[PDB]
Amino acid sequence: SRPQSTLRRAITAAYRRPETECLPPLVEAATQSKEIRDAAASTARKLIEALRGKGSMMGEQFVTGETIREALKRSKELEEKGFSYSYDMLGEAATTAADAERYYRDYESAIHAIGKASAGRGIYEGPGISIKLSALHPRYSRAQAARVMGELLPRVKALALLAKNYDIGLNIDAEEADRLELSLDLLEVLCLDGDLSGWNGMGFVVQAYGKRCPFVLDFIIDLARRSGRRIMVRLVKGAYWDAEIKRAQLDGLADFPVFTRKIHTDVSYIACAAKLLAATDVVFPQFATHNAQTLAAIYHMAGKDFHVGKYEFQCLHGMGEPLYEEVVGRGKLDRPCRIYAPVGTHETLLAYLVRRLLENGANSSFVHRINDPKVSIDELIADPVEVVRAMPV
């Protein structure tokens, strides 16, 4: 039958499976032993106690620099501490060809600058780049997949070839739900392209608030096995939740492509981490979160054996450094963290900044709850898997 028919059918089938039908297998994947659960709660308490023991709306704290040069110069402090970086030249959803070409030239120039600064440190210990496919096609969300792929793939391949030249990471950011299949098809074409052989820096984001997440992960892990590439997989919860809810309503959809209860995203994330941690031979998991409880859960789930290159954590510049200062370093948790680092002017920042406001301002967000006088540390270290597992059915 069609290549990867079973894996692809599973993804499409999940795209709007009832949320109640998506949950049970996730809870089974995410359940841990009492030793791990106790260890996790103990670590999360320590992290929160340190955090509460120690952000401006205008978002200056969210950009590392106006240019890649300034961004690279300002990164030496935290790299000396054991952090790494992933630089994102701000820009998305190009509306004209002129803009899409400027963004492409921005990524191209940035890869040259990051690659020189990496100075051969490789994809795990050295910096990398993150790109958005919507910046590289002037009608990314509107045009037919054939025309989009055909003009996008040459550009992304050229960028991946430069990143291979310097041996740095190149991560494809995850954006809106309706573009997941195109981006996955692009990942598969690159991972099977022989011109990129021998380079493991190709990376891909999967959003755990999506119903497709574990099946997308199944597909990617299988792709890593058949292609021979160790794919970098950034596991996130997701940055577009408000926009997806609204788009699903105006499109007349009966069922959303994303979870509607925040705890379900939490359990989905842990279930997907378990899948990724069992596959570190062929993928490099990158656990992007600012939630101390989520982090503690992954840390103890990953077991006691660790080496750089096994997995890493990630955080956004201006949000995660206080938490991960309690994580990076032999004297803390001895695990690395890559900082996603925006580069650009105030104007290019606003769309990213809106997503940060929706993140930092939501009552349900960890970063809001940690500053909330009415949220107890009891509630902050609460285990979302065990909370769900305990509800009688």
Ligand X SMILES: O=C(O)[C@@H]1CCCO1
* Binding site residue list for FAD: 174, 207, 234, 237-239, 241, 260, 262, 289-291, 356, 359, 364, 366
Q: Select the residue interacting with ligand X from 87, 104, 215, 352 (CB under 6 A).
A: 352
Residue 289 touches which of ligand FAD, ligand X, its own copies, none (CB < 5 to 8 A by kind)? ligand FAD
Stretch that binds its own copies, among 112-120, 179-187, 189-197, 353-361 (CB under 8 A): 353-361
Q: Select the residue interacting with its own copies from 346, 376, 379, 387 (CB under 8 A).
A: 346
- Residue 140 touches ligand X, criterion: CB under 6 A: no
Q: Select the residue interacting with ligand X from 340, 343, 383, 385 (CB under 6 A).
A: 340
Alpha-helical regions (H) of 67-201: 68-74, 76-80, 97-118, 122-125, 145-166, 180-191
**236 and 207 in contact (C-beta within 8 Å)?**
yes
The site that binds ligand X (CB under 6 A) totals a number of residues, namely: 5
CA–CA distance, 231 with 221 (Å, rounded to integer): 8
Residue 352 touches which of ligand X, ligand FAD, its own copies, none (CB < 5 to 8 A by kind)? ligand X
**x/- letters, 231..260, toward ligand FAD (CB under 6 A):** ---x-xxxxxx-----------------xx
CA–CA distance, 155 with 168 (Å, rounded to integer): 17
- Residue 180 touches ligand X, criterion: CB under 6 A: no
- Residue 327 touches ligand FAD, criterion: CB under 6 A: no
Three-class DSSP category at 51: helix
Q: Which two tokens stand for residue 156?
A: 């992304």
Q: Select the residue interacting with ligand FAD from 30, 78, 136, 316 (CB under 6 A).
A: 316
- Residue 273 touches ligand FAD, criterion: CB under 6 A: no
CA–CA distance, 204 with 231 (Å, rounded to integer): 8
**206 and 174 in contact (C-beta within 8 Å)?**
yes
3-state helix, strand, coil in the chain (%, to 5): 55, 10, 35
The site that binds ligand FAD (CB under 6 A) totals a number of residues, namely: 31
Which residue's CB is nearer to ligand FAD, number 4 or number 361?
A: 361
- Residue 250 touches its own copies, criterion: CB under 8 A: yes
Q: What is the DSSP string of 290-337?
A: --HHHHHHHHHHT-S---TTS-EEEEETTTSHHHHTTTSSTTTT---E
CA–CA distance, 92 with 97 (Å, rounded to integer): 13
Give me the residues that bind ligand X (CB under 6 A), please: 173, 239, 340, 352, 355
